[PDB]
Ligand binder design. Structure first.
Ligand code: 3SV
Ligand code: 3SV
Lengths: 11, 214, 214, 11
């Protein structure tokens, strides 16, 4: 869950 | 212990240089990406575990986004200035069926920020205080988040009193918009959930993801 | 200009010396009468026009009543102490179907008031700041109400800093429970409206009158 | 509207 948010935060 | 209003202002200046409701949703989706970059620029936010960064943004994205365009609309007559570079006039919002909430944003937010000439630095902090919400369900270490929130409003009271000596009650006046913001934030989400249910109104992937469970 | 914390504390000390949900509603109806006498005891409240006194109480009765029994339950283990002299334990509220909101009251309110040992004087003021809500729709002279609110939190900051010197951030910590209270207040009303709709749960005349329009 | 509240306030 929360795919987009996680990606944006790791980057 | 290391929460300078200068770094906060920098996060603010770094992120921001036909159916009115559809235009509003397109803008919100747009701002969701920028909000992530904004948070990253807030001192110590990034040092928290990825799970708490997700919780904090999912818990406050709406209030955080409402504070921004409200303060951005301070110079506007009777309407708000969207980030897509589009203006939504009071009447436009009224004839789309969302006049009540729009009016609450103009009266409880935009107007008040204008009456007290709230500055970008003060905004940044209020948004930083909202980001660091220790009450967010799921937090692995809420006390830690509560610490950050205290450093933020300590620096803000410092900024005030020093930048607005003549106004001893400015610090409180600023924090007292928080109940309003929270209230208007809850109402806005309800509308967003209704629009989703109805089936009309295009909702983009990032805004859609925010309306997921929990 | 004439808003002493002493008179506020006096208003507080003067008003307060089987289905858990039904018991809760009976208590709320009970407290609604007392809240009227409380307001009357708050400096300058009575000097406002009767219409503004009605608006202010209709706009805040729920938060005002939630702050009271929360602070009253500070010594309780895992439950709140109703004014009817009845205790509602966490589990009781859970098996009645209202565990989520009840848990938010214990965590966001009761617990925090306990962690910072909020005193009766501080409560009185927070309730007085809530009573004097300039954002209430209908107000004939909102600026006047905003003046009263500023005198109240000025006296509170004065009381703090002086009574809790060691704690420079106590004033803010107290105002920062207001967003939570407003949020929990909105959720509680939703439940009250659902209970009314459902048809079960007896609702007395004064509590019923509060659920009228607007 | 608001019968009870008004009465309690006038008294
Ligand atoms: C019309 C109700 C509604 C709102 C509030 C609109 C507000 C301008 C009154 C919404 C508020 C949010 C969370 C979005 C705000 C993002 C914007 C407009 C981004 C921006 O332009 O800064 C989206 C869902 C529908
Ligand atoms: C269960 C949801 C509900 C609540 C909140 C209950 C709270 C104890 C979690 C309600 C809150 C209000 C506004 C009433 C509170 C009044 C009381 C209990 C008075 C008192 O005893 O001090 C009434 C409607 C139903």
């Amino acid at each position: 869950k929360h795919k987009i948010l996680h990606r944006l935060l790791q980057d | 212990e290391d929460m300078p209003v200068e770094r906060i202002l920098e996060a603010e200046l770094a992120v921001e240089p036909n159916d009115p409701v559809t235009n509003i949703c397109q803008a919100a989706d747009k701002q969701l990406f920028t909000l992530v970059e904004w948070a990253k620029r807030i001192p110590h936010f990034s040092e928290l575990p990825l799970d708490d960064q997700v919780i904090l943004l999912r818990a406050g994205w709406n209030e955080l986004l409402i504070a921004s365009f409200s303060h951005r609309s301070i110079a506007v007559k009777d309407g708000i200035l969207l980030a897509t570079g589009l203006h939504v006039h009071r009447n436009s919002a009224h004839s789309a069926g969302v006049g009540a909430i729009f009016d609450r944003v103009l009266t409880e937010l935009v107007s008040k920020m204008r009456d007290m000439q709230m500055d970008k630095t003060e905004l940044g902090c209020l948004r930083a205080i909202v980001l660091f919400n220790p009450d967010s369900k799921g937090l692995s270490n809420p006390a830690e988040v509560e610490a950050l929130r205290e450093k933020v409003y300590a620096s803000l009271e410092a900024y005030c009193k020093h930048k607005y000596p003549e106004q001893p009650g400015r610090f409180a006046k600023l924090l007292l918009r928080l109940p309003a913001l929270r209230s208007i934030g809850l109402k806005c989400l309800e509308h967003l959930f209704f629009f989703k249910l109805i089936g009309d109104t295009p909702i983009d992937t990032f805004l859609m993801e925010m309306l997921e469970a929990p």
